[PDB]
Amino acid sequence: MKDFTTYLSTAPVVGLGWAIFTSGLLIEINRFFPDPLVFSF
Amino acid sequence: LYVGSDAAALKYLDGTLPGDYGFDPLGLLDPTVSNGQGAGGFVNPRWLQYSEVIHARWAMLGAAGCIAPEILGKAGVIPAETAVDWFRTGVIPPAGVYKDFWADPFTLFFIEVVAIQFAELKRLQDYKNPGSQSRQYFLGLEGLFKGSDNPAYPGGPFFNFANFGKTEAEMKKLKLNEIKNGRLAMLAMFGYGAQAVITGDGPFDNLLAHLADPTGANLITNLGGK
Amino acid sequence: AGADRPLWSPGSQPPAWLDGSLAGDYGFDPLHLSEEPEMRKWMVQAELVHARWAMLGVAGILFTSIAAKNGAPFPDWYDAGKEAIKTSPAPLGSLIFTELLLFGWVETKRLYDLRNPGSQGDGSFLGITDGLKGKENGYPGGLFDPMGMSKNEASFKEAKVKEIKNGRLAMLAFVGFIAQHHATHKSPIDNLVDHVADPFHVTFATNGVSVPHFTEF
Amino acid sequence: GFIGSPTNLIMVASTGACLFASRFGLAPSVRKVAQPLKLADREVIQTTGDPAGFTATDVLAMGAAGHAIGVGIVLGLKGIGQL
Amino acid sequence: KVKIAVDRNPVETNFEKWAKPGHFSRALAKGPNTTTWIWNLHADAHDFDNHTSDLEEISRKVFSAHFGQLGIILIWLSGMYFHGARFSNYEGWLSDPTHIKPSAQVVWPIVGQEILNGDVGGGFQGIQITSGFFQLWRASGITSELQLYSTAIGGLVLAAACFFAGWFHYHKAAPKLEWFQNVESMLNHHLAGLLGLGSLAWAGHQIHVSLPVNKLLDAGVDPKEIPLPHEFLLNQSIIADLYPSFSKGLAPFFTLNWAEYSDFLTFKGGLNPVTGGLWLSDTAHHHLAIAVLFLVAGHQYRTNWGIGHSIKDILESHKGPFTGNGHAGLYEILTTSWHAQLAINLALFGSLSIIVAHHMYAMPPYPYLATDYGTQLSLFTHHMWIGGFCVVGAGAHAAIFMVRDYDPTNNYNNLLDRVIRHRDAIISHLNWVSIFLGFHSFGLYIHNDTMSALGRPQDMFSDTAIQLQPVFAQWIQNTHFTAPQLTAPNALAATSLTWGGDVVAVGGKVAMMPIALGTSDFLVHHIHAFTIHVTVLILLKGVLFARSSRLIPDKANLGFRFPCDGPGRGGTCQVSAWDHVFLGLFWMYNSLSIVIFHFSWKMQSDVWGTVTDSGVSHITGGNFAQSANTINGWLRDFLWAQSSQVIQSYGSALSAYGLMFLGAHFVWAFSLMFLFSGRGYWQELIESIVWAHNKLRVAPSIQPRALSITQGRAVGVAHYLLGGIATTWSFFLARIIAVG
């Protein structure tokens, strides 16, 4: 497990996790707020 | 005698196995094949003997269960509507399903899955660890699962309750007879499958057709040729 | 409580981190989870809270379905929330955030008791010192154990084993509830009386789901 | 496929000639390989009661070759109007 | 002699080596200290010849890597079948294949990309696919989405089995070196079971499943009204009234009366007029004959039963008088060197992909395949580029074998030694013929451009001024048009419609029509020959001069992949065989770009189009006979006359193509400074950036370094090839979808 945990601790795995998290956050924001351009409320 | 023995194949095998007719053209009983430690590959003499005897027992059960309903339906023993062909019982719904059963075929399939998964997984755990199933409490009948040195022949108060084979000579005779009838059953089940595919009828019907018309009803005429 | 104990499969080799000390330790871990002691105690706490909520929810579902079969005007366990908020004085939105508000305190206390054992029973919460102190990892005791049958070690151990076994059975019950409600669209007690009415025919193979029918022949 | 049919007769004659060939020279058996001819060689596979080298792989290979030669000759004659 | 040799559990299945990234090599085993280490970790990852010197472990790694690639391919195929099962209009396409476009990709509406879900027809919205999977499934008898779902599930199961097989045959039961070295057994089993048995199984599927479903589909009945394939399999009545020879029931096969099977095993050449594809019975008899031929070929090599040929004996026996030791040491080379086998496999596989592209643009072996111009163009271009990449990698891995696995002790007077012994003459003659071909083709093009711009249309090398007609190609076309007349009397028609004859059209669109070859065709064919000749020159110069040269006599000690030998001897940059492959990659790109441009223009001008009562109206009006003789014609009448759909695709479903088009141009530009520049400039810029990060104490512990010269060349060629291929892909697909 700790060998597997250090494998997930490697740079490409945490990079993939960050990319998935950021892409999902931005996609859900754009879906639930369709076409945001002007900062108004 | 030796049934089609091939030379340069008895170099790696002596006479210990029941049949051991020396027939090994391709070569799979060589200890050089899959040599090392651990589980390894599935081509090893221990697993080969175990799978051969298990295939033999299953094919013997299948040959008996494919012969008995048709023969007993030709007589007055079992009723005729329960004497359907072995492929029409529900094993292949394109071939036929016996609708007059006490349960749905998938319900029987699930009951079979639970029961035979229990049986075969206990068998596998005893194959990997000999005598291990006699230690963990099952129902109080753990002593029935003592096993033996050979995984193929566990024995005990249930598998050998008749206690046949007290000495070595008749035990070797029984093992040789079991493997001979089992190999005959492999051939029998092979023929049953081929006859079912290319005739669409029961094996006893094919036997009666060959007996009544030897030249007019055989493999050549069943393929359309003359 | 170890060594020659019944495992999840006879003849299996138990893991090194599963020595049988924990309740329900059958040596079942193909994926080698709970190897680290901190992850082991996290897994024990997670299993305990999932078990407790599983038996609570399954008991509520069974009680409501039994009363509905007997004649009480109770809806099915599925889509009960719709009629619940229809008859609730409290609307949705406020209800879930209210539940989160009175849940965050207990969850924070549980998490910081799991990370720091005995730190909750320091008089910080309304001057409570003897109470709110975890006797074990996922077994707080104190105010949560008013009657003291857990003082005996043997009684505590057998109660832990019974609790974890009934909790795992409750996970299986909840999974079965979801599966055969998606398959039959009926109450679990309705499925039970259908199975005890015609056991040889009414089963998982006759609902039109689970086992698919394509040729019908 | 008919018994006594000319196609079956010619292909059976070809298969029998191929089988009787390697029994005495001509065709490359296990014990006769060489580059252009027949040269002495080992056995490896037991002949199972067969004199010289005429084991099961020999009869299998030569029966396959005989069946192939027979069907080729039969279809070539059928293409040009013969049997 | 031949037997299974397997070691039990040589490698433990643990995750301890997943934590340490660099573990296969001792250089990366010490951990990282600079950023190039990371690139090295992603460079020598699958260079198993450098990790260990033991051939057995290398062979085991190769076996497991092949199992992993097969699992990846099966996962991809299962995903294709799943996309056809759920996010597709295959059932709607089966009703009217000539009016609904094939679509199997549906996007999520997120940021306005839902406009990519175009109106393909049949009440569906999605991306118009050009892979031709719809035609393949129609050829396979697939009717409902349930069959596609089952195929996807089976493909996922087989991919899991392949991954388990890789894990098992590496970690649990690893085959020994003697198991891999049984080349005779490998060849026999591959020719008999991998190819012969597969061809027989596919022929049986075609005969028992694909032929009746395709016949009923061509009859015009509803796909739902068509009986399921198992109904054809079991009950013989439907296959009997669909094909009377099935009423005999396997009698004509064993009684040698194979002519009775002539109804469903046919030899009608050409295309089926109902669907514009190859006849399914012809494909069934084809795969049956292929299976029989490969079954015959699989019993050639002696393995364990005396009879059969020996590869070493065959190689050693073929020795001529002008070649010394004829094929002597090649058996030991190909049984010990993985890279020589890789070179041979890649060369033959790339050539096979080229034959595949040519022979399925020529004969469309799928129902309603020729009507979809976009599918045919995409398939041709894709197989073309895969073949070109594979034949480049052939020279690459041949050079790798020459650097690493070549032994002069086993090669004294053999064929390889004599090729090395006259490599200078080989390269000089190849250079001369490359120069001559480039002159007498491209100078002809420049001559045409000049005399067109000089107002001399009578001085051109065109179809009207100076006829350099392809007399050999025209004669071969006329001979193959008359192949069924005299030399193949049992063929009902010609083997293809490209030689001549009538015009086959489906749905008002031209499926296949005769192709005329003129002066422009001769010019582009000789241009292609010149480009292939130059690429061969580059790759052969890389292979033969990989070990030594008069310029550098110890190039073998420098390895296969080194940047240079310094600025000595005037400069020795890009002297390695790897750099030769890197240079030849661009030449392969240019060659295949010109080839696919010729293909697209030729089918758009002289093959594809619509059929009216007056005649055949092509897409571009047949300008190839008058505009393809000049570079300005390719600029204007092919690159500017087309590509208007790509730039005007905005606001439609094709717009992403145009977007990709622009992005492709970007990538094609972004490669150039990796191709230009060097390393010292970027290293000094990185030093300045290191100073900037050190001022703020944010300098990384891993020292950032510029990319290596070999690494920079690889990045440049990869981005250049990606940009060019994506540019051609976007332009081709947008042009062929908007007007096709």
Ligand code: CLA
């Ligand atoms: C007739 C028997 C037979 C068959 C069918 C195959 C088939 C294959 N071999 Mg194998 N091979 C054989 C015998 C056979 N082999 C023998 C006897 C040897 C030892 C001399 C080898 C040694 C060998 C090597 C060294 C390599 C192969 C590889 C391959 C694959 C080539 C890739 C391809 O065409 O994709 C076709 C793909 C498919 C059709 C997908 C389905 C593949 C299934 C799962 C395989 C079924 C065939 C298998 C042999 C059955 C026995 C396995 C059994 C024990 C479970 C292919 C799966 C390459 C490889 O590793 O690929 C993974 C490779 O590098 N072969």
Ligand code: CLA
């Ligand atoms: C791999 C390819 C392939 C396959 C699978 C088939 C299969 C079939 N074809 Mg086809 N055929 C093929 C190629 C193929 N053919 C080719 C190349 C041609 C030449 C053009 C033909 C020409 C042809 C004609 C003209 C006809 C067929 C017919 C048939 C069927 C008859 C089966 C039969 O007699 O075979 C022999 C099959 C067996 C002997 C069965 C195999 C033995 C079994 C599996 C043993 C099982 C034993 C087992 C272990 C025990 C039971 C297990 C259980 C307990 C679980 C069958 C569906 C006929 C049809 O549709 O009528 C029904 C028909 O009229 N075919």
Ligand code: CLA
């Ligand atoms: C389209 C761009 C382009 C062009 C035209 C050339 C041209 C050339 N390169 Mg190059 N190449 C290029 C880009 C290009 N390169 C790039 C980017 C790379 C990097 C991968 C390479 C990689 C490369 C390699 C690796 C090789 C070449 C070779 C060649 C020669 C081709 C052989 C031939 O017949 O040339 C004939 C000459 C031309 C086609 C140039 C145009 C000639 C016109 C028609 C003018 C005709 C004569 C004119 C009338 C006289 C002018 C008179 C005036 C002085 C007054 C030639 C010198 C090969 C070589 O050295 O020779 C075989 C070789 O091995 N090149």
Ligand SMILES: CC(/C=C/C=C(C)/C=C/[C@@]12O[C@]1(C)C[C@@H](O)CC2(C)C)=C\C=C\C=C(C)\C=C\C=C(C)\C=C\[C@@]12O[C@]1(C)C[C@@H](O)CC2(C)C
């Ligand atoms: C099944 C389950 C967990 C299963 C876990 C498994 C198999 C793990 C297996 C393994 O880890 C092992 C052992 C070892 C590893 O090496 C390998 C894996 C494979 C990883 C949890 C269920 C857990 C189930 C829970 C917690 C159920 C809670 C139910 C509640 C709260 C009900 C609330 C209700 O709201 C409803 C739903 C509807 C309303 O009508 C009524 C009310 C009452 C309102």
Ligand SMILES: CC1=C(/C=C/C(C)=C/C=C/C(C)=C/C=C/C=C(C)/C=C/C=C(C)/C=C/C2=C(C)CCCC2(C)C)C(C)(C)CCC1
């Ligand atoms: C004298 C003697 C005897 C006898 C013997 C005999 C008589 C034998 C025979 C034998 C034989 C007689 C054999 C055979 C075999 C065969 C085979 C083995 C076959 C095969 C086949 C095949 C493989 C086929 C194929 C094909 C197909 C199907 C398709 C295509 C074409 C072809 C044809 C190729 C005895 C014993 C009594 C005693 C002693 C002495």
Ligand SMILES: CC1=C(C/C=C(\C)CCC[C@H](C)CCC[C@H](C)CCCC(C)C)C(=O)c2ccccc2C1=O
């Ligand atoms: C530009 C250039 C460099 C400098 C470039 C270097 C060192 C490589 C830089 C790679 C970067 C770090 C890749 C990752 C870029 C982004 C940070 C990743 C994407 C981020 C978004 C997803 C947010 C060379 O080192 C070089 C060497 C030899 C020949 C030509 C050149 C060359 O042209």
Ligand code: SF4
């Ligand atoms: S350092 Fe660069 S410029 Fe200098 S010889 Fe090497 S590759 Fe050429």
